[PDB]
Structure formats: C-alpha cells, structure tokens
C-alpha cells in the first residue's frame, strides 16, 4: 500500500598511499632536506545511502505534491561510515639552514598534514535530473551583534603639598569623552560552504575557518635568539582536522514524471591534504636581535579524491510508484503471464524479479504493465497488451473467496488453456480451460 | 511479527595489579628514591550490550532501508557497568635532592596516578563488516565567539597651582585610540576524540584537555626559598580522572545481506595511567633568590588494556529477519521435520533450539529452511528440500480450525507415515497416514 | 500479562547520640577547654525502594534486551525519607588563651558541626551480581569557558603650562599592549563523586566543594587587635550542610539468567561530621600589630554510618518473569496440585503464597513449575513432574466455557480421583473421577 | 475500578490580635517611648488538602510499587487559601533621645513589622507513619560561577618638553601584571529551608535571605548632622514580606500495609513577626562630625502559630484500596447483610455509609468484609464470616442477567429467608426463601 523504494548503500573506500601524501620536508629549502610521508595510514571510508522512489503512489490524483521521480543521496547519522582519516597524531620535524646568515630564515618546522578542507561533489551525467533540495539547505547567513557605547567623565582634584618651601595648593578639573564600537559573531574551525554551479551539480565543502593559516597556529610571535622550541600550538588543531571527519549531507534529485533513458550520478569525495610549514626569521637590530615566527601559506596542497557512481534507469518499475503483482496461471505448477517486447502475452515460468511479468492493479481495476504503464490487459483482445483507456473490458475484479478474475464489462472470468496457457474469457471452465488465477506481489525493487 | 534480535552482555572485568601501576618514586632521581604503587585497587569493569539483527524483517520488499546484517555494540545508560577506577583519593610524596646545589632541581613531589586518557577500540577480524554509524557521531566542530572592539577617547584638563612662587595655570589635551580582540570557546577536562583508521576499526578516546599537563595543575608558579609546600592544586583533578569513568558510545557494523562465514569483533578497553611529577627549581639571583615550580611531561605512562571479543556467524538464523517455526508430526509424541546436511528430510525428536528443524513461513506461504533460506518444503518431492521458486507446490496454507497443512497447488494435505514419519501429500488420512501437523515458534535466537 | 515485580521499602533509621558527635571544645587547646556536643538531635532517616524483576517476561524470544535477573535499588523523588539531619541552626563558642603571648594564637571559635560529605555505599556479599547501571550515571565532565583578549592603545597628549617663568609646552605619546586570559566554570557547594571500586560495589559521595575548608568560611582575613567578633560568615553554610540532606540515586544490579543461590546487598549510608575551628593569630609588627584569622583543616572528623541489608534468593519465582497460577482440584473444597522436593505431585490444601503450588502457563501450553522452570506437568506420567521438552503430552489447553483441562496429544481431559486427588487422563468423568479443574493467579511475589 | 481516596480540606484561620504584635516603640529607649501595634489586621488563612489512600488497588500483585497506606498533605496551586498577611503597607515612627549627648544614639526609627520567616511544621503523634517524600524535595544545592582572570600590560611613553630652559626629552616603560577572581551566585529574598528532625517530622521555613537584617535595609550609611530623614529604603521590602505569603509544599506519609490503630497529624503554621529598628549614631570628629546609621539585630521577634490536626484511623476502609459494595436482600424493601463485632451475619436496614455492611468483591470472586479484609462470606457456614482462604465455597459469581449470586463450589444460589433474612444456599427458591440479591457501591470514603 505504501510507496515502494529502491534502497542501497554505496561504499566509498580509498586508502591513501604513502607516496600520495609525501611532501618536501622543508618549504624554504625544499631541494635540500628531502621528503617524507606527512600522513599515517590515511584513508577515506564513507557509506552513502541511495533511495529511488516516485514522489507519490501510483494513480493518486489531486495531491499537493507534484508528480516526479526522486533520487535521494544521503550521508546521515543512520549511515555514514568510518569517515576520512589522515593521522593518529601530529608530529613535526625541525630543520636548520645549512649556512649561517644575518637577516633570513634560519629555522623551519614541518608539521604533519591536516585537512585544509573536505569536499563532496554531486554530479550528473546528463540534465534529465535537477537538484530539488539539499541538506545543508544553504550557506550560513551570519548574525552579528553590534554595540555602541558613548560616555563622558567629569573629575576634580584638590592637592595640598607641604614642604620646606611652603604650602602649595593644586586644583584640577578633567573632562573626558569616550566612544566605542563592538562587533561580535561566531566562527567554527570548519565552515560548510555550499556551491551549486548549475541545476545538476552541487558541492559541499567543509573549509577550515578559525585557524585556517599556518600563521594562526603559532602561539608565540617573537622570541630571543637562544630560544629553540616548536612554535606551533598543536592544541589549536582539533581532531576533526586529521583523526576522523564524517560529513552530514543530503541531496535530492528530481526528474520529470515522464523521463526516459538513464542517468549516471557521480559522488566525488575528497580531502585537501595540507602540510604545515613554519619558519623562524632572524631580525638583527642594534637595540636587540630577536627571532620572529612566520607561517607559509603558499606551501603545497594535494587533493585526494575517490569517485563513486551509480546509474539510474528512469524506466525502473520503482518510478511507477506502485507495487506490482504477477498473474500466475494456477492450472500449471509454474507459469505466469509474461509480456514480450512487442506487447504480446505468453505463459512462461514465473520469476519473482521479472518486471515483464509484473502488473499494477490500479484504482480502476486495470492491470497495467509495470514495465510500461501505458499498456493494459484488455479482455477484448487477450493476446497483446492494449493502450490504457476507459474500456470496460480493461477492468477486472476478483470474484470473492475464489481464484477467479472476472471482466467488468461482460462478467466472464479470465481463463487459460490447460495446455498452452493462452488467455481467454469464459463463462465457465471446461476440460481444456482453467479459471484459476493466483496473484502475488513481485520483488522488482532490486537495483539492476 | 516484529524483528528478532540476538542480545547479550559482554562483561569486561580486569583488576589492575599493584605492579602494573608501580612507577618510580621520583622523575629527577628515578634511580635513588625507589618505586611505589601509584594506584589503589585499580580496576576496569564494563558491560557491553551486543545486538545482532537484520535491518528489515524477512521478505519485506520496497523498503527505504537497505537490506543488511547489523551488529550493534553499545555502552550506554541502560548498560554500562561499574566503570574504570584508579584511586579513591590522590596523595603525594615529597623528595629532596640528597646533595645541595645552586641552580638545579632540589625538591620533587610525585602525585598518585590519574588517567591521561581512556581509549576504547573496536576492531574486526576480517572485512566482512564495515562501520555504518557510531555514537559519538563525529569529532566536535568547535564554535568560537569573536569580538572586535574599537574606541577613542578625548580629554581636557585644566590645572591651577598656587604657591609662594605665584599662580600657575595648566591646560592639557588627550586623545586615545583603542582596539581589542576577544576569542571565546569552550573546553572540557576530557574531550572525546573519534579516530577511524579504516572501515573496520574505530577508536574513541577521552583525552584530558583542560588540565592535561602537570604544569597546568600548579596553583602557584614562584615562591620564596623558605616555602616548602605541595604546589599542586588537587581540586583541579576531577573525580572523573581517577575515581570512576564510564564511557557512552555505540558502534554499528553492517555486512552485506548475502554475507557468509564468520567474523570476530574485538573490543579493547584501556586506560593510560599517568603519575604526576612536579619539581621545584632553585633560581639564585643577586636581587633575590626564589624557587620556580615545574611539571614534567616526559614522565612515564602505562596503558592497561583489557580485550573482549565475540564471534558472529553471518549464517545465524537471526540474520534472516524472520521468526522460525517447527513442523511437529502430531501423531507422534515428539517428532519434528528435520533437514540434514544434504537437504533430505527426516523425522527426529524435536529440539526447540535446533535450527535444522526451523522454518520461516513467508508471505507466499512457503516454508523456507531457517538455516538456508534458499531451500523450501516442496509438495512435489517431500523427501528433500527444493530451491525456492514460484512453484505452487511450494505454497502451503493452514486449513481453518484444524491441524492440517494443505498444499496450494492440489489442495491435498501434508501427511506423515504413522511409523516412520515420512512426509507425503494425501487427500485424506488412513490407518497408516496421519494428517495432524502442529507448529510452534522455535527459539533459535541464542548466541551460539 | 505484564512483568511482575517484588517491591518493598527499606527504612534506614539511625539517631545519632550526643556522645557520637561530641568533639573537643577547642583545637589549639584541646586538653584545656573540655568537650561539648556539636549536633542537636542528629538523625539519619532514609527509605530505599527495592525492585526485583526479570529483564523480560517469561518465554519471550528474540528480544533486543538480554535475559537477566535485575535488582534495582532506588532513592528517588517518589521514595526518599526525611533525610540526614545534624542541626537546627549553627552556633559557636569563643575561647581565649589562658596565657598571654606575642606571636601565637590567642583566640579560637568552634562552630557547630556541618557535614563534610554524605556517602552512600552499595555492596554485594558475593559476585553473583554486577552493577549494570547507576544514577548519577557518571562523574561530571566539567565544561570550561576560555577567553583570550588582546589589545593595543595609542595616545597623544599636548600640555601648555603658563606661569611667571614663561610659556612651557609638552608633547607626549603613549603606546600600550594588553593581553588577558579568562577561565570560567561552575561549582556547587556539594559535588557528587561516583566511585566504583569493582563490579560489585559503587559509592556515591556528596562532597563539599565551594566552601570545603574552614578557611573559606571566613568573611574577613585581617583585623585590628581590639576587634573581637566571630569571623565566620555563617551565610556561606547552606542548610544542605546541616538541616536536611536527601540524596537521589539509583543502582541497578544484574545477575545471570541462570544464577542460583543467594546474595546479600548492603547499603551503607553515612555522614562525615565535621566541627569547624577557627583561630585568631597575633602578628606583632613595628609598623602595626594586627590579627589574622585562620581555619584549621586537620581538625577531627567523625563518620556516622547506618547499614541496611537485604537478601536476594536468585531462585525466587519473580525471576522467572511469569505470573504463576495454581491448579485447584474442584471436586474438593480446598485441594491444589503441589510439587514436593523430588518432583512428585500430590493434592494439598491450597496456599496462595506457596510457590510449590504455582505453575506458569507458557506459550506452548505447558504448565511449568514456578519453583523450577525445567519441570513440566506431563500427561504421560501424572505423578511426577517431567523435564520440559517438546512432548505433545506436556501441552494443555482449556476446553472453552468449561473447567476442563485437556491434553493436546490425546485430547483427554485432566481428571483427579475424588478421594485422593490423584491426577490422570480420562476421556470422560465417572463416579470416582472428576474433570473439574479451577485455576487462579497466585501471589508468590512477596519478599521472603 | 480506580483507586479510592478520602479527600478533605483543612482550613487554618487565625486572626492575629493587636496585642499579639504590639512591640516597644523604640529599642534603645524601650522603657520611655511606650508601645504600639506593628501590624494591621494580621491574619493567617490557609487551606490544606489531605488525601488518604492505599498505594495500590486492592488485590494487585507483582506491582513495582510497594504496598503502603499513604497520607498526603498538600498546600499547592489548586488549594492554598488567602495566605499569611501582616500589613497593607509599612509605616514608621521617629523617636529622639530626650537628653542630648556627644557620642551615642540620638535618633531612632521603628518600622512596621515584617515576616522574618514563615515556618510550617508537619508532625505525627506516633511513629506508625514515616515521611516518604516531600515537596520541596530538598534544600538547594547552590551553583556558583567562578572566573579567573590573568593579564599583563606593556607600555612605553615618549615626552618632549620645550620651554625657556631648553628641550627636555622623556622615555618611560611600564609593565603591569593583573589577576582577579570572580564569584557569582543567586539569592532570593526568601529561601526555603527544609529541616527534617526525624522520620515523623519535617518543617519548611521560608527565611529572609537577601535583605535579612535591618542594616541591609539602609539605603545610606552616613550623613551630615543637619540631615533628618528616614534612612530605610522601603522598596527593598517586597510585598512578600508583609502583604501576602502563600507557601507551596507537599508531604507524603506512609504507613505499613498492616498498620492498625490511629495516628494524629499536626500542622503548625507560623510567622516570625519582626519589627525593624534603626538608629542614628553621632560621631564627633575634629575634622568633621557626621551621623552613621545602624540597624539592630537583637530586637524582639514574636512567633505567631496556628495548629491544625486530623486523626487517621489506619483501619479505615479507604486503606484497603478497594471499592466496597453491599449485599441487599431484595425480598425486603430495606435489608442488607451486616457483620457485627464477632463476625456474625444479620440482616439490618441498609446504610450506605456503614462499613459493617460493605464487602469488596475481589479477583477470586470472594466477598471480603471491608472492615476486616481477613474475613470472607463463606458458603459452607453462612452465619459467621470465615477467614479468607482458597475454599471454593468462598467464591461467588453472579448469574448472568439476573439478581442471583451463585456459589462456585456447588453452583447453588445465595438465598435468604423471607421473614428473618437468614442466609443459606439453595438450588431454587421456594415460598419461604428468596434468591434475589441486589448489590450497589457504598460510600464509606467520608472522613470519620
Ligand atoms: Ca492545501
Ligand atoms: Ca520515501
Ligand atoms: Ca533493533
Ligand atoms: Ca520494571
Ligand atoms: K561589550
Ligand atoms: K568581552
Ligand atoms: K570576561
Ligand atoms: K566578570
């Protein structure tokens, strides 16, 4: 009775090799210090849930929901997978300049790679489907709190200084005017950015926001020359950026209710791997020589992607919105009514997953072919399916408490020849004709 | 009618011996001051709840949930156990340097061990199962509150100083410009870090965050030489660190609906035991000699683990999603239809937990073997189970208000020989054949 | 139909005698000033609610809840009792040193005792039961709010001083740099600390947190010598400390579904009674002599405990999960089927609370003994209970609208001899045999 | 079907006479200035709701609620009364010292009395009942917000002074270190303090908290001598202090399910009436003479109490938990079965409120005397009530669609002699015996 679905999981598993995230050990002296792997068993492991369905059940008229074929791709709390992993913990290596100098970089630290962003792109092979809705629904409309302060202050002062010179009196008056502005807003360390290039493609990117630059990771900005310590505050790097990331997003595609052909849906899951480079700069000043710490933002990044795809055939029986049944000729042990390519009807061995043996019993009482809902079983000519119309010969009702299917127009029962299974209309059975018809729901809702 | 489960508890009990958390009494003089136990009846006591189930009931088609075999491992409010325990209360010992000096560490305190972190690792013996979802769902996306302030201040001052010298007048003007930035965020003393190396393994770690270092536990940083007191603020160490810790987490594994074989699931519960070492450093300055307190972070830690495991056989009857019944031949006191290894049918003494005597009565009316859902009881050949298909001889219905099982194809009843229990189809009973069949639900949902 | 319970209250009443909380009048001069009672009709009055039950109803298979025997001990809003009481109000006594001095304590106040902590310990006599869950669920994971501020300030100043000496002009420039850190967190005056030593014992302690020391109760730290007043701010001592304390906690124990024997559960409710001692110290300085107030933390404390216990017999009928009935032989005025020690059946005068006359009517239709669910009433041999199996002679059904119990295998009715009550199977009653059986629910759910 | 209650209101009305709150006009000169009434038609008007009930309905076994007899005393939103009233508005009188002086109190104001506290004490005459639960559930566990701030500030200053003497340059450097602690918590002007001396008595006191002292009511602390004004800020005295106070509290007592005898419950409602005295102290100083305002805390207080009480008979029929019926012999116009003191049965004129004519029709079908649930109507001997047991002669069922009560054991109907109403068992009625029995619910749930 309820709306049928085609539901399946898509596993996206992609181990990231050691060479796939090997970067130069240093950014200032990239040609001298060699290279090393900045990850440790990096991996992508996601599980998408895909649903195919019609927007409404078969034959429902006057609904407030438009008729459409819906493809829903979801990565939610019920089905997410392990996630994207880069590192168990972050380490660093320190490198010094092989030659001494005066005003240049003399030290460098390279920290294990973090995820600059995670990107998930949903594409479509053709334009038969359009994005109907997504989750997250939209980019954030940031809320700001503004605050204006105005103040004044009035003061007086009376002093009395007594010394050998003589009494000395002071009188002072002060007036001050103050004005300040405040701005308050919220950030996160990863901000979701939704980017919809056109009706067929949308991408969700979780981008580093609060500490996005290597410079922002420094807990100290200046130091004395004798200080030689790691200047990065690793506590500012959340485990969300290397240990495990799981996105939450939904994409709903829709096609027109009369769409034909097929469409490939592609999901691109990627992580922008970014090693962190920091350098110490020697500033020689006559007053005092100090070192200043800097982060390099032009350092290399590598995007590691895994693509998953599935094909949707818009003529799949799930997009009729109905639950099909078969018509089994019960004089035989295993024979069902089957429709071939040119609409003719034959009796073949029943197959529960064969859509050519599936019919939808609609509201009018017609048996419409599940593979082509424009064709009906017509009692006037029971050798080929006929175009659905309002013919009374196309309407059937089940005789109560029996296995007889009767035609509405004439009241005759659907019978089949006991030798060949050829269908016909008969007032009553005889030696050569059986009136026993058995119907059961078929399972045509497997992804094929 | 509802979906069956296999549910059981796994107790993880591990007393931690005195030697398992014996550390050096001192960190600076580890070879001189001996060792002592830093715990007091440390213990791990957890109770995991495991559920085995199918994602859907047997034979349901067109659902929005994909077909899958689900393994759920839970440590929640309904079933958690005592928890992980290290100490009733924290004590300390003070040690002094055996030799006096000038600029070195001269005092040390070693505090009873706390839990640096609690780690729970969920592994899998092979890749037949993948992590589908977890709780906690993901690592935290930290929210920051930024605040920008800009201000200006204008002032004037008018002074009048009178003395023996003569009247003196002052006029002053001030202008100030201010700019400040605020950053606000929340921490905890234990932060959950989710780490999913691949599709088969996930680890949850509760890591000390707010006071993670021995240095952060010092309530004072400097003191005069004559001061000799414990410099650690024990109020900063919550009872969550040593008295009792109970995690809350769920892991859901999934296997394909056609998975075979078996899989071992391993749960590793561990605590990273960390003694706390602090030292007082003597700083001799000509202006003034003082002592500065330091915490040592390179001090030893010991991880104490307890592993629990259970085996899941993917061919368990619970993963069919149906509730099996037996077919008892009621002419005998105790005889049931039983399937042997090669599919033949015999009559044996009924066993309520024998899956070889269990059948699922499906929607079509077939009796499919619970141990192999591809085999049916077929009325055409009642000596071996046959492959499930759409044969009408494989469909059975119960005659109303009787103990007769009738075949759909021919209408004959299932009968058994009164001496050997051999099955057959009969229009009516006779002296040698009984038509009495009794069915009851079997209990095949025990973990075996 | 629903799950039966054994429910009862445990009253824990313990008046605390005057000598049980008599402490020394002074801490500095404990041998000179005598002793006094620091309480006023101190009392412990708690009411625990205990529930015994099975986790599931009898015979339920395939549930997501594991089979277990549950013991629930609760002290909640529905049943708590009066609480723990120490004082109606807090008073103090002042004591002075009998000898004058220069730099020593010269005054002391001893305040009426408060509760340093309230402790509730749940123990178990053996390891047949394990803690499954508690309330409070765990120790608190404290949440901290961190705040970083950075600022700069730029200023200019222009002064013009005019006097007899001549015009004088001033020009000044200021630059400031500021940095501050904030840490915010919540405390209570009593913090719950959960301490689970092992799988059998858990203790909950409400420990003073915000004002835990006598020093923290002083509203003033220094004073002039002539000042002679009580230096304790009694408003900082909440009525929760002495007037009435009621804990809220739950402990759920579980045993194996096949546990035998018995187990003693012990509840230890205690209060750590602590008198408050403060002293005034005379500090003689040439610049100025003052007095500083101090609190003494090494002052004595006394723990006053009351132990309650109850015994759980794991073979109690409540742990079957079923609601038993008796089988009354209705030809007699008062005769029921009774099982003796070795399984034989006799007719004895009915007792509604006798578990030897109680049977569970299970899903199969068997009458299993409530005192031993492995024994059934078997129609093949109606003189001794038989091991439960799938025998059809062990299944019974009630003939509709009558008082006849019929055997499933043969259809014969259960009858009893009209003189001795010996059971048997009969097609019909006669002069010596009655077929009238009456069944009613028995009350075996009293704590015994 | 549902659980019966005995419900009634207790009105506590106590007008407070003028002399009952007449205090001295002054505190410093109490013997000179006379006395006056500090209230204006002070009054106590409260309405308590009392419920008597059993914890469970009659005959319910296996419940998670223990069997108990419950007495509930409530003062809630549904039933509270007018409240406690002291004054329409607060006025004051000013008094001056009859003799002038130098350093002493020279003025005094006496303000109309406020309520220092409202106290409600629930007592019990004996220990048959214990406090099971209350509302408010417990004393408040105050929550504190702590805040630590640490900061540093660095500054430089460059000055250039130009005058006739010559150019003068200044260079300054500043460094500051700051540290602050914050503590935040909530108070009310009336705090509820629960005080449970033992299992039988609990008191609730609403005590003034925020402005509890006469000193805290002063809006000014010092003034010049010529100032002569009322120094009390009457806006700090809420109308809750004098105009109307209504408490909200519940007390639930429980007794053993087999308790006998009676118990008196006492409710003491009182208000601690407190006049407010303030004085002005003349401080003569050579620099300047001023007056300082003081409040006196040792001023008199008077507690005005009204006691209400009610008696609970633990053998009241409401504590059976069942709804009784009577057995009316319907051959008479007005005759019911009645039980006398020694258990004999007679026919007397029916009284709907007579518990001696009330029976509970229990689950077994027994007619249990409502005044003594250990006695049943037994068909073997219908002249005296018999001890309840499992006799089949003690079970009755109503013949359908008739007024006949039939015995379960023999099937005979309960009949009564048409002249005397003597009960008996008869197969059929005759001229001297009527089989017509009429039953109706009786109203035994009035407080008696
Ligand atoms: Ca509408
Ligand atoms: Ca849907
Ligand atoms: Ca489930
Ligand atoms: Ca329960
Ligand atoms: K602000
Ligand atoms: K701020
Ligand atoms: K702040
Ligand atoms: K603040």
Numbering used by the authors:
A (entry chain E), B (entry chain D), C (entry chain C), D (entry chain B): 133 to 580
Which of the paper's sentences describe this entry?
Vibrio α-hemolysins (αHLs) are β-pore-forming toxins secreted by Vibrio pathogens, crucial for the facilitation of bacterial infections through host cell lysis. These toxins are produced as inactive precursors, requiring proteolytic maturation and membrane association for activation within host tissues. Here, we investigate Vibrio campbellii αHL (VcαHL), and establish that its hemolytic activity is significantly stimulated by calcium ions, with an EC50 that aligns with physiological calcium concentrations. Using X-ray crystallography and cryo-electron microscopy, we decipher both the immature and assembled structures of VcαHL and elucidate the conformational changes corresponding to toxin assembly.
The VcαHL was assembled on liposomal membranes and solubilized using styrene-maleic acid (SMA), yielding SMA lipid particles (SMALPs) containing assembled VcαHL. Cryo-micrographs of VcαHL in SMALPs were acquired and analyzed for single-particle 3D reconstitution, resulting in a density map of 2.06 Å resolution. The map revealed a heptameric complex exhibiting C7 symmetry, featuring a β-barrel transmembrane pore channel. In contrast, the β-prism lectin domain was not visualized in the map due to its flexible position in the complex, as indicated by the fuzzy cloud observed in 2D classification images. When compared to pro-VcαHL, the protomer of assembled VcαHL displays several conformational changes post pore formation, in addition to the substantial relocation of pre-stem loops. These include a slight clockwise rotation of the β-trefoil lectin domain when observed from the extracellular view and a minor displacement of the cradle loop, which seems to facilitate interaction with the adjacent protomer and release of the pre-stem loop. We thus attributed this extra-density to a calcium ion, coordinated with four water molecules, in line with the size of the density and the observed bond distance of 2.3–2.5 Å, typical features of a hydrated calcium ion. The hydrated calcium ions bind with H137 and E185, orienting the H137 to form a hydrogen bond with G194 from the cradle loop of an adjacent subunit. In addition, E185 in pro-VcαHL forms two hydrogen bonds with Q311 to maintain the association of the pre-stem loop with the cytolysin domain. These hydrogen bonds are replaced by coordination bonds with Ca2+ in assembled VcαHL, potentially facilitating the detachment of the pre-stem loop and triggering subsequent pore formation processes. In addition, the cryo-EM map of the assembled VcαHL uncovers a distinctive feature within the pore channel—an unassigned extra density located between the side chains of R279 and W314.
